[PDB]
């Protein structure tokens, strides 16, 4: 009972891996050294005793659909990630990700995680989204999907500004304790 197993899923332009590296290395997203390896571990304190949080990164592409669930056994908590400035990744949360994890792990808790929230207040991004007649996902929308899909919680962060980063994993850790 030494390591929490937290499995992270989502689409591949969501910034989900840059998020785990930033939090794990305690660095801003431009200052970490690119790694060739997958997965991340960090030490977290439970009552003064030292515990390891293990972050299992998954590739979200369809080519890995057959192999990804083999990582699901022994999972304590899931993190379903989407960018708040990519509506497709948000639709893929309802369409693909919550289905897949709830099918294989029907009793394992999961959080809904919004990334790149800094770009919500970005002019160029807000215009690029205008050109395709889409607007960024608002927290109320994501909270509604969180309640509908039965997520433990909805959490938002920015790996660039660090805002809400610590709270994502504080909330993952509490969910993993069951």
């Amino acid at each position: 009972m030494q390591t929490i197993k937290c499995v992270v899923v989502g689409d591949g332009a969501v910034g989900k891996t840059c998020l785990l590296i930033s939090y794990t290395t305690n660095k801003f997203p431009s200052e970490y050294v690119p790694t060739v390896f997958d997965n991340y571990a960090v030490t977290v304190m439970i009552g003064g005793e030292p515990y390891t949080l293990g972050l299992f990164d998954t590739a979200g592409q369809e080519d890995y659909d057959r192999l990804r669930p083999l990582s699901y056994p022994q999972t304590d908590v899931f993190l379903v990630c989407f960018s708040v400035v990519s509506p497709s990744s948000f639709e893929n949360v309802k369409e693909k990700w919550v289905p897949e994890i709830t099918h294989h792990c029907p009793k394992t808790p999961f959080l809904l995680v919004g990334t790149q929230i800094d770009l919500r207040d970005d002019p160029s991004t807000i215009e690029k989204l205008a050109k395709n007649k889409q607007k960024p996902i608002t927290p109320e929308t994501a909270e509604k999907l969180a309640r509908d899909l039965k997520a433990v919680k909805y959490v938002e962060c920015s790996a660039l500004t660090q805002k809400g980063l610590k709270n994502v994993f504080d909330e993952a850790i509490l969910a993993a304790l069951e």
């Binding site: 305690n26 660095k27 431009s30 200052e31 390891t52 610590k166």
Partner: protein
């Protein structure tokens, strides 16, 4: 430099540190007061008798109390204070050296009950060390380089670089927002910006209409020669002044690139004084740096992963999930480039002609060690899985065989 002004300041700093929970800094305040009283009591014939050198076993920082311009009982009371906060701050290994002078006093008094008490305290301090040392249970702090820029804004900090010793597991977002809050209120939030670039800031590039705070995580640094000492979790936080961080850059001029152009700079910051000190920040007086080639980056990261895998396997009680995290993260990479991107870029016959022979030969040897480290981690995992991870383990094995076969082609050599 004038005794009563220094002593008053040290006491108020101790009280502040205690309220803030910087308990090591409080303890260092009391040892500096005790060293101050001892040097003052020495300088005025009173007859330890050496003055401030009496407490060098605790910290070398007390040398600065010797730039000075009060009885024996109150000196003993500053050491009582000092022991109190050494307890609370979990620096138990120091309580003995602080109690040795006190024991000398009561030997002369024939106060046997006090002698029993004092020896008992030291016994208790070492009992705590024995039952806690080297268990990752003690959180001595996280360290951050913090640099201030803004001629029209910053007072004594303008243009200066500090190491900030933060409590327990304080993360980047915590110290960043806290420093930003504090200086936003004194300068107006609209003029305060955080520098995330970990390269030495060039002031010309900065707009003077703003105040800038550069924040960078650092960790205590030691070279192989220093591993003689520093065998303890305490020893790695006691009397230290060197801190390290790495910064990425490419051959062209970007931060991040593909594996064959990816470099990194390793920078070592040396502080004015040793931690712990009477303050929780200390000014950096010098930087040392070196840089690593793309093939040297590969060698570095490959060495680390062999050590990681090997250590997990040799544990007295293997942590299964932790071993699986690292094992799958080596033989079964799907998001990042995977270790075989290094073999392609630096070990393939045609690419290896672009790097010095000795560097490619060291990379080949670490890759051999890596195949062996993955193989061992696989055999260890096989002894631990239950029925629910049979197919998982089989898939790791098939990746590992596939990796082994590709590595063999690249190296033209039988990797078993």
């Amino acid at each position: 430099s004038t005794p009563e002004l220094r002593r008053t300041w040290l006491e108020s700093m101790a009280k502040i540190h205690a309220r803030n929970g910087d308990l090591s800094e409080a303890a260092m305040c009391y040892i500096h007061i005790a060293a101050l009283i001892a040097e003052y009591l020495k300088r005025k014939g009173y007859w330890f008798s050496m003055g401030w050198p009496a407490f060098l076993s605790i910290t070398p920082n007390i040398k600065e109390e010797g730039a000075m311009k009060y009885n024996e009982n109150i000196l003993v009371e500053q050491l009582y204070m000092c022991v109190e906060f050494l307890w609370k701050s979990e620096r138990y290994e120091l309580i003995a050296d602080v109690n040795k002078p006190i024991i000398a006093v009561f030997e002369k008094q024939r106060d046997f009950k006090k002698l029993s008490d004092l020896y008992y305290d030291i016994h208790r301090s070492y009992l705590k060390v024995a039952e806690v040392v080297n268990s990752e249970k003690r959180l001595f702090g996280r360290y951050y380089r913090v640099a201030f820029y803004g001629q029209g804004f910053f007072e004594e900090e303008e243009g200066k670089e500090y190491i900030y010793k933060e409590p327990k597991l304080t993360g980047l977002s915590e110290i960043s927002q806290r420093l930003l809050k504090l200086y936003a209120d004194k300068f107006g939030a609209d003029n305060v910006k955080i520098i995330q670039d970990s390269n030495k800031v060039n002031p010309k590039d900065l707009d003077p209409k703003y105040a800038y705070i550069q924040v960078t995580y650092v960790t205590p640094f030691f070279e192989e020669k220093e591993i003689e000492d520093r065998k303890t979790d305490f020893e790695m936080h006691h009397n230290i002044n060197r801190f390290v961080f790495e910064t990425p850059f490419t051959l062209s001029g970007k931060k991040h690139g593909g594996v064959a152009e990816q470099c990194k700079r390793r920078t070592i910051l040396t502080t004015s004084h040793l931690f712990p000190y009477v303050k929780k920040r200390i000014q950096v007086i010098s930087q040392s740096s070196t840089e690593l080639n793309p093939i040297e980056v590969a060698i570095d990261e490959m060495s680390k992963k062999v050590s990681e895998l090997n250590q997990l396997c040799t544990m007295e009680e293997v942590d299964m999930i932790r071993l699986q995290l690292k094992l799958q993260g080596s033989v079964s990479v799907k998001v990042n480039a995977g270790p075989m991107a290094y073999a392609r870029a630096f070990l393939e016959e045609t690419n290896a002609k672009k790097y010095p022979d000795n560097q490619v030969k060291l990379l080949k040897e670490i890759f051999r060690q890596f195949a062996d480290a993955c193989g061992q981690a696989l055999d260890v995992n096989e002894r631990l899985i239950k029925e629910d991870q049979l197919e998982y383990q089989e898939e790791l094995r098939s990746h590992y065989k596939d990796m082994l076969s590709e590595l063999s082609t690249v190296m033209n050599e039988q990797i078993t």
